[PDB]
DNA sequence: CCTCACTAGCGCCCCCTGCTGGC
DNA sequence: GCCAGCAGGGGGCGCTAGTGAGG
């Protein structure tokens, strides 16, 4: 095989190899011209100007949805369709469709905490979820309930709200130890830790 | 030396679950 | 108890930068 030796990469074929030192160069030609991100290969210009104007043309068979990208498109189909998780855990059976998900599930046998927050001492296993925290901080609250307009920190605090306040003939959970009608079933769990031991 | 799939990595957002603490 | 705040374990998509290989 031929060896880079500069990334130590190796490729059976002599047209991959030229184009692996291209990729070193990290010089960018191809210019989108509707905003200023260049490229350095006309094919990802190419899929830059179709997300520009939304042409999919990946279509998958066994929905309606399509695609920019070869790749979405297969991606698409483990999640949907084939069920195919190829990265799996080695101390359970948990598997993922992406790797990101497996080292996050990963965070979670191991309790590591990579991500810190730069106000507090919190830190979470997932990016995302360390934005999620910073409206502890700022106060935000992103979400609105259509019908009263509450607005809310978190999109399934919200959908608790329309439950328990907008729908009606809502089942209700009784205690089984005394005549006590809770509406929500973690507040029995509280109800049953203080008068029930 | 084309061409299109497949891979790796970044980001986004939501889901459900279940508890906490002010009221 | 009612209620919003809030964290933990998750799924699915948007977009880019590469690689693998039939042709
Ligand atoms: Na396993
Ligand atoms: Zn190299
Ligand atoms: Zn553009
Ligand atoms: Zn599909
Ligand atoms: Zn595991
Ligand atoms: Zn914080
Ligand atoms: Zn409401
Ligand atoms: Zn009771």
Redesign the pocket.
């Known amino acids: 095989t031929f060896q880079?030796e500069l990334?130590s990469?190796?490729?059976?074929?002599?047209?991959?190899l030229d184009?692996?030192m291209?990729?070193?160069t990290?010089e960018?030609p191809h210019k989108?011209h509707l905003c200023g991100?260049?490229?350095?290969?006309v094919?990802?210009?190419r899929?830059?100007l179709?997300?520009?104007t939304?042409t999919?043309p990946?279509k998958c068979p066994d929905c309606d949805?399509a695609?920019?990208?070869?790749?979405?498109?297969?991606?698409?189909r483990?999640?949907?369709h084939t069920?195919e998780?190829?990265?799996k855990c080695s101390m359970?059976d948990?598997?993922?469709?992406?790797?990101?998900?497996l080292k996050?599930?990963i965070?979670?046998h191991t309790?590591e905490?990579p991500f810190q927050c730069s106000l507090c001492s919190?830190?979470?296993?997932?990016?995302?979820?360390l934005?999620?925290?910073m409206?502890?901080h700022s106060?935000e609250?992103?979400?609105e309930?259509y019908i009263?307009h509450?607005?809310?920190?978190?999109?399934?605090?919200?959908?608790?709200?329309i439950l328990?306040?907008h729908t009606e003939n809502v089942a209700?959970?009784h205690c089984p130890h005394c005549d006590?009608?809770?509406?929500?079933?973690?507040?029995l769990?509280?109800?049953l830790?203080?008068q029930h031991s």
Do not use: W
């Open positions: 880079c990334c990469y190796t490729c059976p074929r002599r047209s991959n184009r692996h291209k990729s070193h990290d960018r989108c991100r260049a490229f350095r290969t094919t990802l210009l899929n830059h179709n997300t520009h939304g999919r990946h949805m695609f920019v990208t070869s790749g979405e498109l297969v991606r698409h483990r999640y949907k069920h998780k190829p990265f359970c948990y598997a993922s469709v992406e790797v990101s998900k996050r599930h965070r979670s309790g905490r919190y830190a979470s296993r997932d990016t995302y979820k934005k999620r925290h409206r502890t106060g609250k992103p979400y309930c009263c509450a607005r809310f920190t978190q999109s399934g605090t919200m959908k608790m709200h328990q306040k209700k959970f006590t009608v809770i509406a929500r079933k973690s507040d769990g509280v109800h830790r203080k």
